[PDB]
């Protein structure tokens, strides 16, 4: 009600608006170190 507000609010994405008001898909990569033995990195470059 009055001064009791639902905390979330909608974007309401419209195709008409400008680039600054356009939707954008954001993907955030994260890395730290050392929490386990390392498992992931790039492929080995093997030749003949």
């Amino acid at each position, epitope marked *: *009600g*009055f001064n*009791c507000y*639902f905390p*979330l609010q*909608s974007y309401g994405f419209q195709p008409t608006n400008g680039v600054g008001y356009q939707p954008y898909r954001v993907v955030v990569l994260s890395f730290e170190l050392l929490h386990a033995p390392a498992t992931v990195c790039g492929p080995k470059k093997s030749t003949n």
Partner: antibody
Amino acid sequence: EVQLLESGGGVVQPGGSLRLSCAASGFAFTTYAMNWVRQAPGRGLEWVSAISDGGGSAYYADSVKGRFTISRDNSKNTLYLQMNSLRAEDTAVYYCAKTRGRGLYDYVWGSKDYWGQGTLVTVS
Amino acid sequence: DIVMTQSPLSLPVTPGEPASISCRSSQSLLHSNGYNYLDWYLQKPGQSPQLLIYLGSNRASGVPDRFSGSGSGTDFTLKISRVEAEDVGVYYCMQALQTPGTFGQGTRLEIK
């Protein structure tokens, strides 16, 4: 901006099924609650059913437990009301109407600020 | 549940004259926060009903200023200062406390 559209509801033989579909255009249909209303020609309204967010919580009025089947699609923003065992006293103006309620003590069957456009179901 | 009463139901009121509309409640609708929980509506013929007054006192969106609700506890009253041909409608009342949303029997306002 915000308005509610209905579809279906007409001449039907009693004791069968019917389909009524409620599609929304301009609100956050995931977050808002949803409610169902029956109104006969010549006497005012009667609540029949209500659902909370994401399905799960479905409620029914006294005469309509089991007779009515309710369902919700959060992807295509459509509200359905699957119909079973129609009776001549179910000839009433059927329409979807939305609720405010998003708080903890807002009681999804409660304060319903908008109402839908409206269609008449004739069970005869 | 809440045994609700709207009386009198058929209201022939001359246009330009004030009209007094009441709805009565069995249980007290005053909550622990001090606010009133009963909502006043109007249904036009063929047009979907509107919220006119929420919580007994305040502006619902688009409602003109001459519509005003009153009351406390059980005895509430809806008043219009001036009635015109756009004020014809059937006046309902709904609560928000218990599980079943109880409506009123509908107060038909008529123009003479």
